[PDB]
PDB file of N, CA and C in Angstrom:
ATOM      1  N   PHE Z   1       0.846  -1.179   0.000  1.00  0.00           N
ATOM      2  CA  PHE Z   1       0.000   0.000   0.000  1.00  0.00           C
ATOM      3  C   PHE Z   1       0.880   1.226   0.000  1.00  0.00           C
ATOM      4  N   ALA Z   2       0.310   2.353  -0.414  1.00  0.00           N
ATOM      5  CA  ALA Z   2       1.066   3.589  -0.471  1.00  0.00           C
ATOM      6  C   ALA Z   2       2.302   3.421  -1.340  1.00  0.00           C
ATOM      7  N   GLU Z   3       2.126   2.750  -2.468  1.00  0.00           N
ATOM      8  CA  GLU Z   3       3.245   2.460  -3.337  1.00  0.00           C
ATOM      9  C   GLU Z   3       3.800   3.722  -3.969  1.00  0.00           C
ATOM     10  N   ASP Z   4       2.947   4.688  -4.269  1.00  0.00           N
ATOM     11  CA  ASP Z   4       3.330   5.928  -4.943  1.00  0.00           C
ATOM     12  C   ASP Z   4       2.461   7.016  -4.327  1.00  0.00           C
ATOM     13  N   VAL Z   5       3.025   7.751  -3.385  1.00  0.00           N
ATOM     14  CA  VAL Z   5       2.318   8.823  -2.713  1.00  0.00           C
ATOM     15  C   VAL Z   5       3.135  10.084  -2.841  1.00  0.00           C
ATOM     16  N   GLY Z   6       2.529  11.139  -3.348  1.00  0.00           N
ATOM     17  CA  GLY Z   6       3.272  12.370  -3.502  1.00  0.00           C
ATOM     18  C   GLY Z   6       3.550  12.999  -2.160  1.00  0.00           C
ATOM     19  N   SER Z   7       2.471  13.349  -1.494  1.00  0.00           N
ATOM     20  CA  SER Z   7       2.526  13.961  -0.189  1.00  0.00           C
ATOM     21  C   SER Z   7       1.531  13.265   0.693  1.00  0.00           C
ATOM     22  N   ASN Z   8       2.004  12.861   1.854  1.00  0.00           N
ATOM     23  CA  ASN Z   8       1.137  12.366   2.899  1.00  0.00           C
ATOM     24  C   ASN Z   8       1.266  13.312   4.076  1.00  0.00           C
ATOM     25  N   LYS Z   9       0.204  14.040   4.340  1.00  0.00           N
ATOM     26  CA  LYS Z   9       0.089  14.841   5.540  1.00  0.00           C
ATOM     27  C   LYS Z   9      -0.880  14.228   6.528  1.00  0.00           C
ATOM     28  N   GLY Z  10      -1.538  13.144   6.143  1.00  0.00           N
ATOM     29  CA  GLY Z  10      -2.491  12.487   6.985  1.00  0.00           C
ATOM     30  C   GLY Z  10      -1.956  11.136   7.371  1.00  0.00           C
ATOM     31  N   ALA Z  11      -2.838  10.145   7.406  1.00  0.00           N
ATOM     32  CA  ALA Z  11      -2.498   8.828   7.890  1.00  0.00           C
ATOM     33  C   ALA Z  11      -2.804   7.832   6.790  1.00  0.00           C
ATOM     34  N   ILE Z  12      -1.841   6.982   6.476  1.00  0.00           N
ATOM     35  CA  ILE Z  12      -2.060   5.850   5.594  1.00  0.00           C
ATOM     36  C   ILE Z  12      -1.654   4.637   6.390  1.00  0.00           C
ATOM     37  N   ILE Z  13      -2.628   3.794   6.713  1.00  0.00           N
ATOM     38  CA  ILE Z  13      -2.436   2.720   7.667  1.00  0.00           C
ATOM     39  C   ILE Z  13      -2.838   1.418   7.008  1.00  0.00           C
ATOM     40  N   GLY Z  14      -1.919   0.466   6.977  1.00  0.00           N
ATOM     41  CA  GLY Z  14      -2.249  -0.870   6.543  1.00  0.00           C
ATOM     42  C   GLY Z  14      -2.080  -1.830   7.692  1.00  0.00           C
ATOM     43  N   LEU Z  15      -3.189  -2.343   8.199  1.00  0.00           N
ATOM     44  CA  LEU Z  15      -3.162  -3.366   9.234  1.00  0.00           C
ATOM     45  C   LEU Z  15      -3.452  -4.729   8.616  1.00  0.00           C
TER      46      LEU Z  15
ATOM     47  N   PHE H   1      -3.663  -1.101  -1.585  1.00  0.00           N
ATOM     48  CA  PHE H   1      -4.509   0.078  -1.585  1.00  0.00           C
ATOM     49  C   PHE H   1      -3.629   1.304  -1.585  1.00  0.00           C
ATOM     50  N   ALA H   2      -4.199   2.430  -1.999  1.00  0.00           N
ATOM     51  CA  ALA H   2      -3.443   3.667  -2.056  1.00  0.00           C
ATOM     52  C   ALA H   2      -2.206   3.499  -2.924  1.00  0.00           C
ATOM     53  N   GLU H   3      -2.383   2.828  -4.053  1.00  0.00           N
ATOM     54  CA  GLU H   3      -1.264   2.538  -4.921  1.00  0.00           C
ATOM     55  C   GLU H   3      -0.709   3.800  -5.553  1.00  0.00           C
ATOM     56  N   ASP H   4      -1.562   4.766  -5.854  1.00  0.00           N
ATOM     57  CA  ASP H   4      -1.179   6.006  -6.528  1.00  0.00           C
ATOM     58  C   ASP H   4      -2.048   7.094  -5.912  1.00  0.00           C
ATOM     59  N   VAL H   5      -1.484   7.829  -4.970  1.00  0.00           N
ATOM     60  CA  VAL H   5      -2.191   8.901  -4.298  1.00  0.00           C
ATOM     61  C   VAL H   5      -1.374  10.162  -4.426  1.00  0.00           C
ATOM     62  N   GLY H   6      -1.980  11.217  -4.933  1.00  0.00           N
ATOM     63  CA  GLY H   6      -1.237  12.448  -5.087  1.00  0.00           C
ATOM     64  C   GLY H   6      -0.959  13.077  -3.745  1.00  0.00           C
ATOM     65  N   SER H   7      -2.038  13.426  -3.079  1.00  0.00           N
ATOM     66  CA  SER H   7      -1.983  14.038  -1.773  1.00  0.00           C
ATOM     67  C   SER H   7      -2.978  13.343  -0.892  1.00  0.00           C
ATOM     68  N   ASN H   8      -2.504  12.939   0.269  1.00  0.00           N
ATOM     69  CA  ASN H   8      -3.372  12.443   1.314  1.00  0.00           C
ATOM     70  C   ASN H   8      -3.243  13.390   2.491  1.00  0.00           C
ATOM     71  N   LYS H   9      -4.305  14.118   2.755  1.00  0.00           N
ATOM     72  CA  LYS H   9      -4.420  14.919   3.956  1.00  0.00           C
ATOM     73  C   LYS H   9      -5.389  14.306   4.943  1.00  0.00           C
ATOM     74  N   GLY H  10      -6.047  13.222   4.558  1.00  0.00           N
ATOM     75  CA  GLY H  10      -7.000  12.565   5.401  1.00  0.00           C
ATOM     76  C   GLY H  10      -6.465  11.214   5.786  1.00  0.00           C
ATOM     77  N   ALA H  11      -7.347  10.223   5.821  1.00  0.00           N
ATOM     78  CA  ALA H  11      -7.007   8.906   6.306  1.00  0.00           C
ATOM     79  C   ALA H  11      -7.313   7.910   5.205  1.00  0.00           C
ATOM     80  N   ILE H  12      -6.350   7.060   4.891  1.00  0.00           N
ATOM     81  CA  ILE H  12      -6.569   5.928   4.009  1.00  0.00           C
ATOM     82  C   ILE H  12      -6.163   4.715   4.806  1.00  0.00           C
ATOM     83  N   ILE H  13      -7.137   3.872   5.129  1.00  0.00           N
ATOM     84  CA  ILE H  13      -6.945   2.798   6.082  1.00  0.00           C
ATOM     85  C   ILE H  13      -7.347   1.496   5.423  1.00  0.00           C
ATOM     86  N   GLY H  14      -6.428   0.544   5.392  1.00  0.00           N
ATOM     87  CA  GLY H  14      -6.758  -0.792   4.959  1.00  0.00           C
ATOM     88  C   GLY H  14      -6.589  -1.753   6.107  1.00  0.00           C
ATOM     89  N   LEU H  15      -7.698  -2.265   6.614  1.00  0.00           N
ATOM     90  CA  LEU H  15      -7.671  -3.288   7.649  1.00  0.00           C
ATOM     91  C   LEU H  15      -7.961  -4.651   7.031  1.00  0.00           C
TER      92      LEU H  15
ATOM     93  N   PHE X   1       5.355  -1.257   1.585  1.00  0.00           N
ATOM     94  CA  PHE X   1       4.509  -0.078   1.585  1.00  0.00           C
ATOM     95  C   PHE X   1       5.389   1.149   1.585  1.00  0.00           C
ATOM     96  N   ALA X   2       4.819   2.275   1.171  1.00  0.00           N
ATOM     97  CA  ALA X   2       5.575   3.511   1.114  1.00  0.00           C
ATOM     98  C   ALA X   2       6.811   3.343   0.245  1.00  0.00           C
ATOM     99  N   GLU X   3       6.635   2.672  -0.883  1.00  0.00           N
ATOM    100  CA  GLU X   3       7.754   2.382  -1.752  1.00  0.00           C
ATOM    101  C   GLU X   3       8.309   3.644  -2.384  1.00  0.00           C
ATOM    102  N   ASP X   4       7.456   4.610  -2.684  1.00  0.00           N
ATOM    103  CA  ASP X   4       7.839   5.850  -3.358  1.00  0.00           C
ATOM    104  C   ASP X   4       6.970   6.938  -2.742  1.00  0.00           C
ATOM    105  N   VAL X   5       7.534   7.673  -1.800  1.00  0.00           N
ATOM    106  CA  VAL X   5       6.827   8.746  -1.129  1.00  0.00           C
ATOM    107  C   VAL X   5       7.644  10.007  -1.256  1.00  0.00           C
ATOM    108  N   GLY X   6       7.038  11.061  -1.763  1.00  0.00           N
ATOM    109  CA  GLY X   6       7.781  12.292  -1.918  1.00  0.00           C
ATOM    110  C   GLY X   6       8.059  12.921  -0.576  1.00  0.00           C
ATOM    111  N   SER X   7       6.980  13.271   0.091  1.00  0.00           N
ATOM    112  CA  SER X   7       7.035  13.883   1.396  1.00  0.00           C
ATOM    113  C   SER X   7       6.040  13.187   2.277  1.00  0.00           C
ATOM    114  N   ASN X   8       6.513  12.783   3.439  1.00  0.00           N
ATOM    115  CA  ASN X   8       5.646  12.288   4.483  1.00  0.00           C
ATOM    116  C   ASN X   8       5.775  13.234   5.660  1.00  0.00           C
ATOM    117  N   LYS X   9       4.713  13.963   5.925  1.00  0.00           N
ATOM    118  CA  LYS X   9       4.598  14.763   7.125  1.00  0.00           C
ATOM    119  C   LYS X   9       3.629  14.150   8.112  1.00  0.00           C
ATOM    120  N   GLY X  10       2.971  13.066   7.728  1.00  0.00           N
ATOM    121  CA  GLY X  10       2.018  12.409   8.570  1.00  0.00           C
ATOM    122  C   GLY X  10       2.553  11.058   8.955  1.00  0.00           C
ATOM    123  N   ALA X  11       1.671  10.067   8.991  1.00  0.00           N
ATOM    124  CA  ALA X  11       2.011   8.750   9.475  1.00  0.00           C
ATOM    125  C   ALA X  11       1.705   7.754   8.375  1.00  0.00           C
ATOM    126  N   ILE X  12       2.668   6.904   8.060  1.00  0.00           N
ATOM    127  CA  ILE X  12       2.449   5.772   7.178  1.00  0.00           C
ATOM    128  C   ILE X  12       2.855   4.559   7.975  1.00  0.00           C
ATOM    129  N   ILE X  13       1.881   3.716   8.298  1.00  0.00           N
ATOM    130  CA  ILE X  13       2.073   2.642   9.251  1.00  0.00           C
ATOM    131  C   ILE X  13       1.671   1.340   8.593  1.00  0.00           C
ATOM    132  N   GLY X  14       2.590   0.388   8.561  1.00  0.00           N
ATOM    133  CA  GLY X  14       2.260  -0.948   8.128  1.00  0.00           C
ATOM    134  C   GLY X  14       2.429  -1.908   9.277  1.00  0.00           C
ATOM    135  N   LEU X  15       1.320  -2.421   9.784  1.00  0.00           N
ATOM    136  CA  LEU X  15       1.347  -3.444  10.818  1.00  0.00           C
ATOM    137  C   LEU X  15       1.056  -4.807  10.201  1.00  0.00           C
TER     138      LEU X  15
ATOM    139  N   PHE C   1       9.864  -1.335   3.170  1.00  0.00           N
ATOM    140  CA  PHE C   1       9.018  -0.156   3.170  1.00  0.00           C
ATOM    141  C   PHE C   1       9.898   1.071   3.170  1.00  0.00           C
ATOM    142  N   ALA C   2       9.328   2.197   2.756  1.00  0.00           N
ATOM    143  CA  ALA C   2      10.084   3.433   2.699  1.00  0.00           C
ATOM    144  C   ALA C   2      11.320   3.265   1.830  1.00  0.00           C
ATOM    145  N   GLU C   3      11.144   2.594   0.701  1.00  0.00           N
ATOM    146  CA  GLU C   3      12.263   2.304  -0.167  1.00  0.00           C
ATOM    147  C   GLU C   3      12.818   3.567  -0.799  1.00  0.00           C
ATOM    148  N   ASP C   4      11.965   4.532  -1.100  1.00  0.00           N
ATOM    149  CA  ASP C   4      12.348   5.772  -1.773  1.00  0.00           C
ATOM    150  C   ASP C   4      11.478   6.860  -1.158  1.00  0.00           C
ATOM    151  N   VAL C   5      12.043   7.595  -0.216  1.00  0.00           N
ATOM    152  CA  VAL C   5      11.336   8.668   0.456  1.00  0.00           C
ATOM    153  C   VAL C   5      12.153   9.929   0.328  1.00  0.00           C
ATOM    154  N   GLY C   6      11.547  10.983  -0.178  1.00  0.00           N
ATOM    155  CA  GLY C   6      12.290  12.214  -0.333  1.00  0.00           C
ATOM    156  C   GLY C   6      12.568  12.843   1.009  1.00  0.00           C
ATOM    157  N   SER C   7      11.489  13.193   1.676  1.00  0.00           N
ATOM    158  CA  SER C   7      11.544  13.805   2.981  1.00  0.00           C
ATOM    159  C   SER C   7      10.549  13.109   3.862  1.00  0.00           C
ATOM    160  N   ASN C   8      11.022  12.705   5.024  1.00  0.00           N
ATOM    161  CA  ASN C   8      10.155  12.210   6.068  1.00  0.00           C
ATOM    162  C   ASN C   8      10.284  13.156   7.245  1.00  0.00           C
ATOM    163  N   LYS C   9       9.222  13.885   7.510  1.00  0.00           N
ATOM    164  CA  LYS C   9       9.107  14.686   8.710  1.00  0.00           C
ATOM    165  C   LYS C   9       8.137  14.072   9.697  1.00  0.00           C
ATOM    166  N   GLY C  10       7.480  12.988   9.312  1.00  0.00           N
ATOM    167  CA  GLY C  10       6.527  12.331  10.155  1.00  0.00           C
ATOM    168  C   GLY C  10       7.062  10.980  10.540  1.00  0.00           C
ATOM    169  N   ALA C  11       6.180   9.989  10.576  1.00  0.00           N
ATOM    170  CA  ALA C  11       6.520   8.672  11.060  1.00  0.00           C
ATOM    171  C   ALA C  11       6.214   7.676   9.959  1.00  0.00           C
ATOM    172  N   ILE C  12       7.177   6.826   9.645  1.00  0.00           N
ATOM    173  CA  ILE C  12       6.958   5.695   8.763  1.00  0.00           C
ATOM    174  C   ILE C  12       7.364   4.482   9.560  1.00  0.00           C
ATOM    175  N   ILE C  13       6.390   3.638   9.883  1.00  0.00           N
ATOM    176  CA  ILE C  13       6.582   2.565  10.836  1.00  0.00           C
ATOM    177  C   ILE C  13       6.180   1.262  10.177  1.00  0.00           C
ATOM    178  N   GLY C  14       7.098   0.311  10.146  1.00  0.00           N
ATOM    179  CA  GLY C  14       6.769  -1.026   9.713  1.00  0.00           C
ATOM    180  C   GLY C  14       6.938  -1.986  10.861  1.00  0.00           C
ATOM    181  N   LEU C  15       5.828  -2.499  11.368  1.00  0.00           N
ATOM    182  CA  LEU C  15       5.856  -3.522  12.403  1.00  0.00           C
ATOM    183  C   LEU C  15       5.565  -4.885  11.786  1.00  0.00           C
TER     184      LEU C  15
ATOM    185  N   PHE J   1      14.373  -1.412   4.755  1.00  0.00           N
ATOM    186  CA  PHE J   1      13.527  -0.234   4.755  1.00  0.00           C
ATOM    187  C   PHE J   1      14.407   0.993   4.755  1.00  0.00           C
ATOM    188  N   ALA J   2      13.837   2.119   4.340  1.00  0.00           N
ATOM    189  CA  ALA J   2      14.593   3.356   4.284  1.00  0.00           C
ATOM    190  C   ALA J   2      15.829   3.187   3.415  1.00  0.00           C
ATOM    191  N   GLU J   3      15.653   2.516   2.286  1.00  0.00           N
ATOM    192  CA  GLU J   3      16.772   2.226   1.418  1.00  0.00           C
ATOM    193  C   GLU J   3      17.327   3.489   0.786  1.00  0.00           C
ATOM    194  N   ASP J   4      16.474   4.455   0.485  1.00  0.00           N
ATOM    195  CA  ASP J   4      16.857   5.694  -0.188  1.00  0.00           C
ATOM    196  C   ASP J   4      15.987   6.783   0.427  1.00  0.00           C
ATOM    197  N   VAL J   5      16.552   7.518   1.369  1.00  0.00           N
ATOM    198  CA  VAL J   5      15.845   8.590   2.041  1.00  0.00           C
ATOM    199  C   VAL J   5      16.662   9.851   1.913  1.00  0.00           C
ATOM    200  N   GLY J   6      16.056  10.906   1.407  1.00  0.00           N
ATOM    201  CA  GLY J   6      16.799  12.136   1.252  1.00  0.00           C
ATOM    202  C   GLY J   6      17.077  12.765   2.594  1.00  0.00           C
ATOM    203  N   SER J   7      15.998  13.115   3.261  1.00  0.00           N
ATOM    204  CA  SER J   7      16.053  13.727   4.566  1.00  0.00           C
ATOM    205  C   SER J   7      15.058  13.031   5.447  1.00  0.00           C
ATOM    206  N   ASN J   8      15.531  12.627   6.609  1.00  0.00           N
ATOM    207  CA  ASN J   8      14.664  12.132   7.653  1.00  0.00           C
ATOM    208  C   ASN J   8      14.793  13.078   8.830  1.00  0.00           C
ATOM    209  N   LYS J   9      13.731  13.807   9.095  1.00  0.00           N
ATOM    210  CA  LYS J   9      13.616  14.608  10.295  1.00  0.00           C
ATOM    211  C   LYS J   9      12.646  13.994  11.282  1.00  0.00           C
ATOM    212  N   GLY J  10      11.989  12.910  10.897  1.00  0.00           N
ATOM    213  CA  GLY J  10      11.036  12.253  11.740  1.00  0.00           C
ATOM    214  C   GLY J  10      11.571  10.902  12.125  1.00  0.00           C
ATOM    215  N   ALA J  11      10.689   9.912  12.161  1.00  0.00           N
ATOM    216  CA  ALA J  11      11.029   8.594  12.645  1.00  0.00           C
ATOM    217  C   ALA J  11      10.723   7.599  11.544  1.00  0.00           C
ATOM    218  N   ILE J  12      11.686   6.749  11.230  1.00  0.00           N
ATOM    219  CA  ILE J  12      11.467   5.617  10.348  1.00  0.00           C
ATOM    220  C   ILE J  12      11.873   4.404  11.145  1.00  0.00           C
ATOM    221  N   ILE J  13      10.899   3.560  11.468  1.00  0.00           N
ATOM    222  CA  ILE J  13      11.091   2.487  12.421  1.00  0.00           C
ATOM    223  C   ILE J  13      10.688   1.184  11.762  1.00  0.00           C
ATOM    224  N   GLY J  14      11.607   0.233  11.731  1.00  0.00           N
ATOM    225  CA  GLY J  14      11.278  -1.103  11.298  1.00  0.00           C
ATOM    226  C   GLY J  14      11.447  -2.064  12.446  1.00  0.00           C
ATOM    227  N   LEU J  15      10.337  -2.577  12.953  1.00  0.00           N
ATOM    228  CA  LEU J  15      10.365  -3.600  13.988  1.00  0.00           C
ATOM    229  C   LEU J  15      10.074  -4.963  13.370  1.00  0.00           C
TER     230      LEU J  15
END
């Protein structure tokens, strides 16, 4: 997940 | 999930 | 996860 | 994870 | 993890 993210200012969570 | 995200300012959650 | 991230100012969490 | 990160000012956590 | 990081001002944690 989140393989290609420009900007993360929040939360990207893989459980 | 979230393979290609420009900007994440919120929450992307994969449970 | 987070294979290609430009800027992370938030949280990217892989559990 | 975090294979290619430009700037990390937040948290990138792989558990 | 963190194979290629330009700047880390935060936390990159691999447990």
